[PDB]
Symmetry: C5
Subunit: 204 residues, 5 copies
């Protein structure tokens, strides 16, 4: 594991090639979780922020951006979308959390909570995933669509297996996150594929 | 009689099913009243905020939202609408009050008074009502329309039988409301029907 | 005479009926004057703010609102209009003054002077008028047009027979007006006709 | 020799008649100069701010306003236009300067310098001019066009025969101008013709 | 070898003639670099900010402005464009840097970093260039297009052969730049050609 503290992955161009493979020992199905990260991009079109597929399952867990001020979350091919007021272009800090028992999906854009939506109550996101950054999988680790490619910068990615409380969300947002157990920026296990440069985080 | 303090009812999806039944011993006709509550929703369409029907009377008392910055009040099937400047989406604090003698309906969005309008002077809203949250009744407790369904969060609901003065409105708005006698959030009598979760109020 | 201090006339609905008759001992023709009052309405259309007719003379003195940020003044059937930047809806404090010698009409929206315009230099507004609030006269005290009706609230009306200087305008605006001699809110002589309620001024 | 300090000329109506003739003490051809004044108008159309014609030459020196946020300067029938961000309606403080050697025209709207433009390098603006305020000359002191008439208020006019430095521009803007030698508000030689009133400057 | 400190080149008009030739002893190919400068223009169309051509190669290094809030960078005929929120018209401070090893182009508008883009990784911009200001070269020092001509003011130009870090960018922006080795405003070697005046920097 590498400590990417103070740095970010910069996907410099539109392609159906460049991407990063995040590696995690997720052996037991996900029931609860929280995902946080920063992104900076001036793309007007829709693009995938975080793709997570398992065998035979497309969009098992996908954080997709529809257009400005509109974020979508997919849980087992199901989808919820919540709106927010935001400038364009501008850096963003996203934290999305889901909880099987209630099915309640909760977005936190820049330390601000959006309206709660619910989906797939009592479902379990399948274990042993293929997590890619920069592209949107339509297969287990592949079948990328160019019009869904993310071009910009991504940093400070953390994923916990629990549903973080407001205090913990804001801390992450403020730069002092709790240690993550599913994916941690300070001990990341990745695989750079294609054209993707690592540079320091200058916009925070 | 449950204390929903620090919590809110979250209606997570559009449906013609989910709703909450508020129960109150209103056995003697309403002549004066004040209703206050918070709501957070990113729905662009129209939707009912508070439905109150009595036997044989539709829209006896309905707080309906026409569109952004436009609120309506129905008293015995009659209606008044007042405008306000507001952002979208964003949490809101609404207090509406009516007084039979003058017929004056008074809205207070986020501690700000909108222009007064008048309707049904000298009328009495029937007692023994059917009060639902999350749907719009077209019958006594039923006949819901999906296109009027409320999806988002609701909290801090209080209803007094008198017409509250400015200082009492602002207190409610500020989080220190006067004890209500028709409906009280700190001693609520409800019936969750369908998909509606209870979660803490994080947006205030 | 009645002291309407801290109160306002609220015209709660669109009609060709409701109005208030202001009674003033004006027996000698007007040569100079200043009018001030507050208004709060969310009407989008045009409406009359202050109508003043004399026998045979329509629009002898009329303060009419064309549309948002556009105020008109009629003096003996002649008209001037001046623009201002304003929000909608929102309470307003208006002061308009006219002086026969120069013909200079001067508007002051919310303590802010608009551009001066000129009309009817050397004219005298007839005395022994018919002053109505809430409707637009097309005859001596009558012939109301529904599409010109004012619906909203009006308060703090004062009318002097002289042309007030800036410091006196701002005082009125700040709530400490000079005693008026043609019409005074603290000693008003009115006649309510139709549906018009008196309530306290909550929006100032 | 009149001191118009603290006052302004108010042109109260659209006409092809009202105007003021400025008479200047200096009889030399112009090579360098600086002009400053305040204006307040809510006219949406184009209109002439300051007209200066000499026998046989139209638009020898003309400060014309094309539309909102767009100011033009004519030197010997030649023209330059520069843009600025501005509200409408709102009072303005304009200072324009030209210098024959370089041909550099320099505008300063509300103490803010616009982009420099250049015209008629090495030209000399004729002497024995006809300077009118409120109309746009198409002949020596005449041939006014109604659609170019200025209606609103003008005050604090000063004109030097040199090109004033930033400090001196800001002083004029702040109300403590350097003594002018071509035209001075505190010792103006004018000739009102038509309907134009003098009133105190209430908007500064 | 001139010190243009506190001054700027002002291109006063649209032409296919006026321009300035920057002279630099670049005999060895560029691999890394940083360019910074201020510009003030109210041109709505596209225009070239900085043209750099070598023998045989067009657009070897060109900083071109597409439209408002949209900046392009060309490296060896290849192009990247990045967006930013900005007012119009308004002065701007631009710093663009490129690094052959990664191919990462980095823009900094008014001390604010835009999203990184990448082009020509492992390329070397040819040495012994023809650098013009005010026009866009389509040949070695010539073939200007009128529709790409820059009209406005440019100042504080500096160009280093290294990729400056955030601190050094902000210093340049704040007026205390590091000494440049490829092009230095305080020791500039230029050649004015056509109508271009030098004046002091009044807008900073
Ligand atoms: N090529 C293309 N153009 C436009 N919109 C697209 C495209 N591919 C997918 N989508 C949309 C369809 C879904 O709404 C979302 C994820 O679909 P998924 O099927 O997982 O890619 O993206
Ligand atoms: N299905 C549907 N689509 C759009 N607008 C509707 C619909 N049903 C009612 N309304 C409108 C009609 C009334 O103006 C208001 C309450 O009507 P009420 O009759 O009490 O439902 O909502
Ligand atoms: N019914 C109606 N609709 C719209 N505008 C109207 C109407 N009646 C008058 N007006 C306009 C005409 C004048 O410009 C102004 C006052 O006219 P006065 O003639 O004094 O009413 O209002
Ligand atoms: N009547 C009229 N309507 C609109 N625009 C006009 C009119 N007369 C002149 N102009 C324009 C033409 C020039 O651009 C400017 C000054 O021209 P000058 O010829 O000095 O008046 O004003
Ligand atoms: N005349 C004209 N009008 C509009 N856009 C133009 C023109 N000439 C070039 N361009 C565009 C074409 C390229 O996108 C960019 C640089 O092209 P380059 O070929 O280096 O000039 O400018
Ligand atoms: Ca997919
Ligand atoms: Ca896809
Ligand atoms: Ca109904
Ligand atoms: Ca219904
Ligand atoms: Ca009339
Ligand atoms: Ca009428
Ligand atoms: Ca002319
Ligand atoms: Ca003309
Ligand atoms: Ca070229
Ligand atoms: Ca070209």
């Amino acid at each position: 594991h590498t400590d990417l503290s103070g740095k970010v992955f910069v996907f410099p161009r539109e392609s159906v090639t460049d991407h990063v493979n995040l590696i995690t020992p997720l052996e037991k199905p996900l029931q609860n979780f929280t995902l946080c990260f920063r992104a900076y991009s001036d793309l007007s079109r829709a693009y995938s922020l975080f793709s997570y597929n398992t065998q035979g399952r497309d969009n098992e867990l996908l954080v997709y951006k529809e257009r400005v001020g509109e974020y979508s979350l997919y849980i087992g091919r199901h989808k919820v979308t919540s709106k927010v007021i935001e400038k364009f272009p501008a850096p963003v800090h996203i934290c999305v959390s889901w909880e099987s028992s209630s099915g309640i999906a909760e977005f936190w854009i820049n330390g601000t909570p959006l309206v709660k939506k619910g989906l797939r109550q009592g479902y379990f996101v399948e274990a042993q995933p293929k997590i890619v950054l920069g592209q949107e999988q339509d297969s287990y680790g592949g079948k990328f669509d160019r019009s869904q490619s993310f071009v910009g910068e991504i940093g400070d990615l953390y994923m916990w297996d629990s549903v973080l409380p407001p205090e913990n969300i804001l801390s992450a947002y403020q730069g002092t996150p709790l240690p993550a157990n599913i994916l941690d920026w300070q001990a990341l296990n990745y695989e750079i594929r294609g054209y993707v440069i690592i540079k320091p985080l200058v916009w925070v």
